Design a protein around this ligand. Structure first.
Ligand SMILES: CN(Cc1ccccc1NC(=O)c1cc2ccccc2[nH]c1=O)C1CCCCC1
Length: 198
């Protein structure tokens, strides 16, 4: 309705002044902050007792993905906005927030494994191609977000550096005692694993 309007309004505002939300867009700090934001979302689910392992993969097409084995974002339709709760999370300001990463991603794939099913939604610059759809069956739970940073927004440093993710992810495992985080670089086979048990 007009909610499709306000979503676009907020998305506009983020793409207009990206540094204000994500960090400096010209020296790689914001670019990498895109990842830690998605990861911080998964860490929350781990701090609530539902996530154990987080898997961050740097893909060959210069996208990153974050996988967890938590509950899966709720997939039920929201009363105020008439779309899945998941889509509200990914698109509404203050639902930072992941919506910022979505708004500043040329493309974003969401995959949720929940109550026996696998749901999927693709976004372009924060805009869904379609409503969250059920794609298939599954016996595991979790959320997977894969994003391709918007090349309009990020300048100079537009490729992820393994060592920056590696350092910060170790730190984040230490800051949230008990979480396991794995980092895979599919470009050259680099791999690492972080976990501080208390
Ligand atoms: C509604 N969720 C919490 C919640 C409630 C019930 C079941 C699963 C969750 N999980 C989540 O929302 C959730 C969101 C998420 C987003 C990006 C990447 C990984 C993610 N992993 C998650 O687990 C969050 C949404 C963002 C703000 C806090 C509440």
């Amino acid at each position: 309705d007009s909610s499709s309007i306000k979503v676009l309004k907020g998305l506009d505002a983020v793409r207009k002044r990206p540094g204000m939300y994500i960090g400096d867009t010209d020296d790689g700090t914001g670019l990498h902050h895109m990842v830690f934001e998605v990861v911080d979302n998964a860490i929350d689910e781990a701090l609530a007792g539902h996530c154990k392992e987080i898997i961050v993969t740097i893909h060959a097409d210069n996208s990153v993905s974050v996988q967890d084995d938590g509950r899966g974002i709720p997939t039920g339709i929201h009363p105020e906005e008439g779309v899945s709760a998941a889509e509200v999370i990914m698109t509404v300001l203050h639902a930072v927030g992941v919506s910022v990463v979505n708004a500043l991603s040329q493309k974003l794939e969401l995959v949720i494994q929940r109550e026996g099913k696998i749901h999927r939604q693709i976004y372009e610059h924060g805009v869904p191609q379609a409503p969250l759809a059920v794609t298939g069956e599954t016996e595991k739970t979790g959320t997977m977000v894969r994003f391709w940073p918007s090349l309009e927004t990020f300048t100079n440093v537009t490729e992820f550096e393994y060592e920056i993710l590696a350092k910060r992810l170790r730190e984040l495992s230490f800051l949230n005692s008990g979480v396991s985080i794995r980092l895979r670089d599919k470009r050259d086979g680099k791999e690492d694993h972080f976990h501080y048990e208390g």
